[PDB]
Design a protein around this ligand. Structure first.
Ligand SMILES: CCn1c(CO)nn(-c2cc3c([C@@H](C)C(F)(F)F)cn(-c4ccccc4C)c(=O)c3cc2F)c1=O
Ligand SMILES: Cc1cc2nc3c(=O)[nH]c(=O)nc-3n(C[C@H](O)[C@H](O)[C@H](O)COP(=O)(O)O)c2cc1C
Ligand SMILES: O=C(O)c1cc(=O)[nH]c(=O)[nH]1
Ligand SMILES: [Cl-]
Ligand SMILES: [Cl-]
Ligand SMILES: [Cl-]
Length: 366
């Protein structure tokens, strides 16, 4: 395990990344993953890593964040990597190209990425048919503790944002264990304004009504994914709305439009969302605040700068029931998944926790 980890991180990934533009490297990764061209996921998930949340069993708490598999092309390969859950998307109602290239930038000195993809999406119909082709295979995976999330976006030219999300609920809701109302992309104009109170309550009411109209076996959990750049007022309002409406959970956080002091990469001043190590603590602190504002009663999926067991446990202790990563995979490759899981298990034992469940929100009880 540690053999593969070292070779991937120290030699293979830096070599491959030095040969390819970042978007090409992304596209090839999706293709390789969809073909199962992957190292052995050596790590056996232990009972200590199981989590029950959102109406589902999760064999382990480490998921792939939205953005890697935007169009649902690599789901089975991502489970083969050892992820305990997979989130696809964002998916928009109609197909759209996204922003002009280049739109992805590597900051290897910062272990960070900046992206401005702009919701490049195959669209709901294409993704629906892709997920339908493996719908019963997914039902068995979910029963076995490997749930699927679908992240919903909106088209660039839409006039009625709530209608775009409602279309996504109707089309992909029946194929998902959970849905994500992504109101926090930094790369669609006006999108993050949907996080404001009046707009959010109206939007989320419509989303929940649509979800509630699906047949029981086809009725997903609904989560809201938020930015790391919210004001204190915005956070208080989101918390209020989520509790009022009975939203099932939060994903905390998307990428940041901030540029923390100390970034070294030449491309630091590119427009887009920043991910990876510089986002880590900003995300952990957003988890911590959202957990407090919701009384620990709203499950949180914690995301932003996770590349180790320690990073995962810090998010869990701050309030996350589950975590996701993406950017670390770009530097470490597939062995990062088993690395995080092994390190997390070790730390849980070292800190006296019986399993992940016992550590959720543990910092708030100090
Ligand atoms: C943010 C966009 N973005 C970038 C650029 O910022 N990189 N990236 C990415 C690339 C890769 C690559 C490429 C280098 C490939 F494909 F060109 F080699 C291989 N592999 C891999 C290795 C060994 C075996 C099986 C795979 C899939 C990965 O896991 C992987 C993951 C990734 F997230 C990615 O999504
Ligand atoms: C290239 C790229 C594309 C992304 N696209 C999406 C997206 O379509 N929808 C979404 O909710 N989040 C998207 N994200 C955000 C990630 O899901 C995640 O919230 C963020 O990158 C923080 O995690 P990380 O530091 O582990 O990458 C994307 C991130 C990256 C790097
Ligand atoms: O498509 C993108 O640009 C994208 C969407 C999102 O939600 N987050 C992100 O960092 N990029
Ligand atoms: Cl680059
Ligand atoms: Cl169906
Ligand atoms: Cl920006």
């Amino acid at each position: 395990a540690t053999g593969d980890e070292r070779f991937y991180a120290e030699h293979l990934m830096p070599t491959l990344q030095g040969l390819l533009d970042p978007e090409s490297a992304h596209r090839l990764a999706v293709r390789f993953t969809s073909l199962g061209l992957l190292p052995r996921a050596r790590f056996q998930d232990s009972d200590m890593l199981e989590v029950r949340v959102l109406g589902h069993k999760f064999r382990n708490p480490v998921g792939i964040a939205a953005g890697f598999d935007k169009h649902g092309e690599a789901v089975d390969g991502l489970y083969k990597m050892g992820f305990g859950f997979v989130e696809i998307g964002s998916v928009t109602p109609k197909p759209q190209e996204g922003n002009p290239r280049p739109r992805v930038f590597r900051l290897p000195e910062d272990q960070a990425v900046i992206n401005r993809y702009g919701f490049n999406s195959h669209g709901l119909s294409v993704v629906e048919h892709r997920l339908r082709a493996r719908q019963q295979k997914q039902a068995k995976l979910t029963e076995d503790g490997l749930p699927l999330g679908v992240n919903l976006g909106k088209n660039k030219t839409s006039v009625d944002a709530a209608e775009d999300y409602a279309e996504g609920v109707r089309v992909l809701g029946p194929l998902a264990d959970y849905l994500v109302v992504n109101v926090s992309s930094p790369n669609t104009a006006g999108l993050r304004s949907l996080q404001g109170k009046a707009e959010l309550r109206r939007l989320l009411t419509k989303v929940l009504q649509e979800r509630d109209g699906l047949r029981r076996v086809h009725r997903p959990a609904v989560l809201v994914k938020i930015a790391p750049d919210l004001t204190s007022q915005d956070k208080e309002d989101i918390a209020s709305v989520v509790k009022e409406l009975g939203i099932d959970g939060l994903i905390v956080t998307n990428t940041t439009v901030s540029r923390p002091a100390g970034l070294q990469g030449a491309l630091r001043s590119e427009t887009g969302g920043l991910s990876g190590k510089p986002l880590r603590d900003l995300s952990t602190q957003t988890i911590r605040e959202m957990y407090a504002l919701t009384q620990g009663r709203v499950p949180i999926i914690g995301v932003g700068g996770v590349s180790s067991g320690q990073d995962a446990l810090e998010k869990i202790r701050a309030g996350a029931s589950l975590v996701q990563l993406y950017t670390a995979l770009t530097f470490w490759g597939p062995p990062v998944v088993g690395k995080v899981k092994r390190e997390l298990e070790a730390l849980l034992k070292e800190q006296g926790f019986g399993g992940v469940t016992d550590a959720i929100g543990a910092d708030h009880r100090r």
